[PDB]
Amino acid sequence: ETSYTLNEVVPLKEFVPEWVRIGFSATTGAEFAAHEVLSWYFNSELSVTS
Amino acid sequence: ETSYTLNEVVPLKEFVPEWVRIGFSATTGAEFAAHEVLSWYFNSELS
Amino acid sequence: TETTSFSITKFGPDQPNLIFQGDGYTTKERLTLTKAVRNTVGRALYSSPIHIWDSKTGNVANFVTSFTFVIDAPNSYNVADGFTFFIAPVDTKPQTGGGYLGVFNSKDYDKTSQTVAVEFDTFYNTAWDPSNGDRHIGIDVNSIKSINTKSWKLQNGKEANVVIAFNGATNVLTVSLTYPN
Amino acid sequence: TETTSFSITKFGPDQPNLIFQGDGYTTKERLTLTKAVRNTVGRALYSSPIHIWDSKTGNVANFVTSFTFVIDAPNSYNVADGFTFFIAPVDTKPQTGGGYLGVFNSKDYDKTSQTVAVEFDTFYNTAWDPSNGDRHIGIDVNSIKSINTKSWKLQNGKEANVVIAFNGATNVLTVSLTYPN
Ligand SMILES: *[C@@H]1O[C@H](CO[C@@H]2O[C@@H](C)[C@@H](O)[C@@H](O)[C@@H]2O)[C@@H](O[C@@H]2O[C@H](CO)[C@@H](O[C@@H]3O[C@H](CO[C@H]4O[C@H](CO)[C@@H](O)[C@H](O)[C@@H]4O[C@@H]4O[C@H](CO)[C@@H](O)[C@H](O)[C@H]4NC(C)=O)[C@@H](O)[C@H](O[C@H]4O[C@H](CO)[C@@H](O)[C@H](O)[C@@H]4O[C@@H]4O[C@H](CO)[C@@H](O[C@@H]5O[C@H](CO)[C@H](O)[C@H](O)[C@H]5O)[C@H](O[C@@H]5O[C@@H](C)[C@@H](O)[C@@H](O)[C@@H]5O)[C@H]4NC(C)=O)[C@@H]3O)[C@H](O)[C@H]2NC(C)=O)[C@H](O)[C@H]1NC(C)=O
Ligand SMILES: *[C@@H]1O[C@H](CO[C@@H]2O[C@@H](C)[C@@H](O)[C@@H](O)[C@@H]2O)[C@@H](O[C@@H]2O[C@H](CO)[C@@H](O[C@@H]3O[C@H](CO[C@H]4O[C@H](CO)[C@@H](O)[C@H](O)[C@@H]4O)[C@@H](O)[C@H](O[C@H]4O[C@H](CO)[C@@H](O)[C@H](O)[C@@H]4O[C@@H]4O[C@H](CO)[C@@H](O[C@@H]5O[C@H](CO[C@]6(C(=O)O)C[C@H](O)[C@@H](NC(C)=O)[C@H]([C@H](O)[C@H](O)CO)O6)[C@H](O)[C@H](O)[C@H]5O)[C@H](O)[C@H]4NC(C)=O)[C@@H]3O)[C@H](O)[C@H]2NC(C)=O)[C@H](O)[C@H]1NC(C)=O
Ligand SMILES: [Ca+2]
Numbered sequence: 365e366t367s368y369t370l371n372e373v374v375p376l377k378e379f380v381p382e383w384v385r386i387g388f389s390a391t392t393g394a395e396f397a398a399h400e401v402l403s404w405y406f407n408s409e410l411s412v413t414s
Numbered sequence: 415e416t417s418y419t420l421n422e423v424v425p426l427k428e429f430v431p432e433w434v435r436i437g438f439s440a441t442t443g444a445e446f447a448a449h450e451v452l453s454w455y456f457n458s459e460l461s
Numbered sequence: 462t463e464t465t466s467f468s469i470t471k472f473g474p475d476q477p478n479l480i481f482q483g484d485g486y487t488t489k490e491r492l493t494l495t496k497a498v499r500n501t502v503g504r505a506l507y508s509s510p511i512h513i514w515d516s517k518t519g520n521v522a523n524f525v526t527s528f529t530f531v532i533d534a535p536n537s538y539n540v541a542d543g544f545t546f547f548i549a550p551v552d553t554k555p556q557t558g559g560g561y562l563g564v565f566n567s568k569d570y571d572k573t574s575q576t577v578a579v580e581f582d583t584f585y586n587t588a589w590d591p592s593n594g595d596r597h598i599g600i601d602v603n604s605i606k607s608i609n610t611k612s613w614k615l616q617n618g619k620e621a622n623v624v625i626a627f628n629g630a631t632n633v634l635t636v637s638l639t640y641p642n
Numbered sequence: 643t644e645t646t647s648f649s650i651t652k653f654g655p656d657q658p659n660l661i662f663q664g665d666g667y668t669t670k671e672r673l674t675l676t677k678a679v680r681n682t683v684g685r686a687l688y689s690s691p692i693h694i695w696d697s698k699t700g701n702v703a704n705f706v707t708s709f710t711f712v713i714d715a716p717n718s719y720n721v722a723d724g725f726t727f728f729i730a731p732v733d734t735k736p737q738t739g740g741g742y743l744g745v746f747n748s749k750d751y752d753k754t755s756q757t758v759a760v761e762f763d764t765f766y767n768t769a770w771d772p773s774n775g776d777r778h779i780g781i782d783v784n785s786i787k788s789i790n791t792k793s794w795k796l797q798n799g800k801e802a803n804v805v806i807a808f809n810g811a812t813n814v815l816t817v818s819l820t821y822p823n
């Protein structure tokens with residue numbers, strides 16, 4: 365039982381291209397653990413007029 | 415104001431695979447015309 | 462639970478979320494499947510595979526698509542060949558052109574097709590189109606000889622708002638073409 | 643309004659929505675990025691590209707992603723290295739593994755990286771992680787050093803629900819993880 369929240373003002377347009385791919389990434393090194401995603405939902409909406 | 419409707423019964427199960435790819439198509443032959451689309455919306459809700 | 466959706470108002474020069482086949486491309490906010498050119502077949506499928514039905518439960522998906530296509534014809538006396546919205550296997554590739562709308566082969570029920578397809582046929586093909594000729598909406602399943610038809614009066618140069626839903630339960634496919642004017 | 647959505651709640655052997663990179667695979671109905679093995683990198687991407695912003699308007703998208711994840715370590719003391727949700731260019735390939743989470747190649751600001759990522763880092767890397775040495779949720783952008791972090795108590799084997807949202811107007815990314823029970 366515990367919850368964490370974080371948020372930073374990130375101006376996405378100047379770091380990422382108009383078109384982008386999204387997804388998950390996980391790694392291991394000298395030490396390790398198993399990472400698994402049990403579910404995934406995503407919704408993006410973008411207006412098209414200045 | 416002019417509509418056309420047609421709703422037939424068709425079991426997709428018996429015909430298309432579980433994973434399909436949807437899209438548009440158009441052709442010509444001896445006769446022709448320009449077939450172009452302007453907007454496209456889609457939504458699947460499978461439980 | 463397993464949803465998939467997308468809305469595209471304008472198609473840019475580069476349309477990443479689409480896979481173009483045949484002579485299909487884009488030009489000025491719109492998607493162009495064919496030009497007013499003899500013999501051509503241009504298709505455009507959405508890039509990500511869709512989960513239509515689950516075997517484990519037998520549930521089918523409910524879905525609704527909507528769009529605004531348009532047929533540009535110089536002379537309204539010799540229009541061809543049509544337009545389609547198909548549901549085909551992931552690895553779908555363009556098939557026979559012309560009267561087959563680039564989706565089917567032969568007028569017989571070939572199981573290999575696995576592609577249902579609603580169409581807006583704008584040209585009379587004897588061995589598979591309604592005897593009275595007449596352009597028409599038409600549902601298909603593994604063949605070009607429509608499973609049912611509805612005469613349609615082509616309104617050249619005029620865009621047409623179409624909606625197409627499916628009830629995975631009652632398995633009823635409702636095609637719907639309306640001219641905004 | 644350009645839009646893209648999908649829900650997945652049962653990954654399968656043949657789960658075509660995704661793109662698997664590295665040692666990523668879909669087993670036990672769950673998306674498996676890595677297992678309890680050394681030096682591996684498992685990434686999975688949604689097949690369809692998404693339009694995050696537009697040039698001829700300057701409009702930026704508005705989005706939300708919700709996912710449940712599980713980091714199961716054999717030993718709760720020695721855990722490494724981290725999970726991550728990322729936004730990268732259309733043709734991303736796995737980058738440096740290990741402490742670099744597979745999405746970055748260095749600590750310096752790599753302008754050409756074009757990758758922003760919300761990381762859940764379970765291993766202290768003295769070279770660039772927060773001095774306190776706590777597991778943390780961090781927001782990276784063009785480098786493995788987070789521009790902001792929040793200490794987080796990893797619950798070995800328990801599933802946390804994460805909710806990340808982005809407001810195109812105020813441009814504030816929001817991330818929330820919650821361990822029910
Ligand atoms: C009990 O607990 C102990 C304590 O645990 C610690 O404390 C707890 C409280 C908790 O916080 C724990 O989380 C925490 O770990 C355990 O002891 C600790 O164990 C750690 C695991 O090994 C260990 O950390 C590791 O350190 C090495 C680096 O050590 C050397 O280098 C340091 C600089 O980085 C330097 O400062 C050190 O001094 C040291 O240098 C010398 O090393 C000699 C031999 O070790 C030693 O004799 C010398 O004395 C020493 N020099 C001096 C002056 O003393 C580091 O490499 C590890 O990092 C990798 O994993 C972490 C995540 O786990 C990643 O963040 C990181 O990116 C690394 O990831 C990849 O690891 C791969 C291997 O797993 C690399 O590969 C190699 O491939 C070749 C190919 O043939 C070969 O197979 C090698 O064997 C592989 O290693 C991989 O390579 C690099 O990346 C790739 C992509 C290429 O770019 C390649 O070119 C690169 O080289 C690498 N990738 C990357 C990107 O780095 C890790 O941090 C702790 O130091 C240790 N002790 C302490 C006090 O913490 C104890 O083990 C536990 N016991 C049990 C039974 O469980
Ligand atoms: C004024 O108006 C008049 C009248 O218009 C009509 O009436 C008005 C009122 C209105 O209703 C209009 O809509 C009406 O059109 C107009 O005159 C009429 O014009 C029509 C158009 O030219 C003519 O019809 C054509 O007829 C030809 C020949 O006869 C057909 O019918 C036979 C009996 O059914 C049949 O057996 C024949 O095989 C043939 O089909 C026909 O070829 C035309 O069909 C093509 O076009 C239509 C529409 O675009 C399309 O639906 C068809 O599918 C077909 O499309 C493709 O067209 C291209 C380009 O021509 C073809 O390319 C050639 O292909 C070959 C090789 O292909 C074959 C092969 O050998 O392998 C050919 C084989 O026959 C075929 N076999 C079978 C069983 O299909 C095979 C097979 O499919 C293989 O599997 C192929 O994969 O393919 C070479 O490569 C050549 O180099 C290449 O050029 C494609 O083959 C073809 N694709 C396919 C899949 O078929 C069309 O039906 C009317 O007859 C004509 N006369 C009258 C009195 O109406 C007049 O011109 C107007 N004038 C003015 C000034 O405006
Ligand atoms: Ca026809």
Ligand SMILES: [Ca+2]
Nearest residue numbers: 763765766767
């Ligand atoms: Ca780390």
Ligand SMILES: [Mn+2]
Nearest residue numbers: 582590599607
């Ligand atoms: Mn027909």
Ligand SMILES: [Mn+2]
Nearest residue numbers: 763771780788
């Ligand atoms: Mn970090």
